[PDB]
Structure 1
Amino acid sequence: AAPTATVTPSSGLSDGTVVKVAGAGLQAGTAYDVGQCAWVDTGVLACNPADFSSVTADANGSASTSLTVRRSFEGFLFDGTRWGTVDCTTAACQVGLSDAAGNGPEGVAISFN
């Protein structure tokens, strides 16, 4: 089984709901993180600490956890600085997983009606 991730709902969340992101086939033995982060530029990742979960890829590496994600969301910049409230109505925020080496599986693009 190859790595992947089932996240849902991807849209119709509304400010204050919870989405369920999952991973399957990830590095079987690598603690991956799981949350809502948006790329607003070349190497700019503003994530929100309200969906920051984490689990290690077990035998195959399945990780399913629910978290709260909305349109505007803390733009935590991976550099100690904060980018500001990242309005998901401007950029595309994906719900995905990752590890602490440099990168990991991808994220699912959510939508806000």
Structure 2
Amino acid sequence: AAPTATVTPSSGLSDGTVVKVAGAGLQAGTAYDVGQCAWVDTGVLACNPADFSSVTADANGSASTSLTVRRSFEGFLFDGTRWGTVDCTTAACQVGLSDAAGNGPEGVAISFN
């Protein structure tokens, strides 16, 4: 099956809340980074590297880890440029997993309202 991710809880969040991130259909035995990002332009994500986590998929291609989410954060682009402050109540924030090459399941939308 194609890779998928789930984030629990995904709504009613507060700054500093810890969520469970699970992935399935991942590459067995591979390291994945887990993080919170927001789409700031067509095909451009601004992320919060200060709270990224990582996990290694098991022999069945499954993984489960915890992530501390932030209501707002200083966003950074892939090239390391500081983008500015991202507010998840007025920007579409998501949590996702990706391998060393940036591949993985689609991200999951979260809400802090």
**TM-score, normalised on structure 1?**
0.87
Q: Give me the whole-angstrom Cα distance separating, in 1, the residues matched to 2:96 and 2:37.
A: 8
CA separation of 1:48 and 1:21: change in aligned 2, threshold 3 A = same
1:50 is paired with a residue whose SS is helix
User: Are the aligned partners of 2:7 and 2:20 in contact in 1 as well (CA < 8 Å)?
Assistant: yes
Cα displacement (A) at 1:2? 4.3
Cα displacement (A) at 1:50? 4.2
The number of aligned residues is 113
Q: What is the RMSD computed on CA atoms of the aligned residues?
A: 1.6
**TM-score, normalised on structure 2?**
0.87
Structure 1 stretches of 4+ with a deviation exceeding 3 A read none
Identity, in percent, stands at 100
Unpaired runs of 5+ residues, structure 2, are none
Q: Give me the whole-angstrom Cα distance separating, in 1, the residues matched to 2:52 and 2:112.
A: 20
Q: Give me the whole-angstrom Cα distance separating, in 1, the residues matched to 2:5 and 2:43.
A: 22
Q: String of CA shifts for 1:24-76, please: whole Å, max 9, x gaps.
A: 11012321111111111123211113431112222122121111112212212
Unpaired runs of 5+ residues, structure 1, are none
Q: Give me the whole-angstrom Cα distance separating, in 2, the residues matched to 1:18 and 1:102.
A: 23
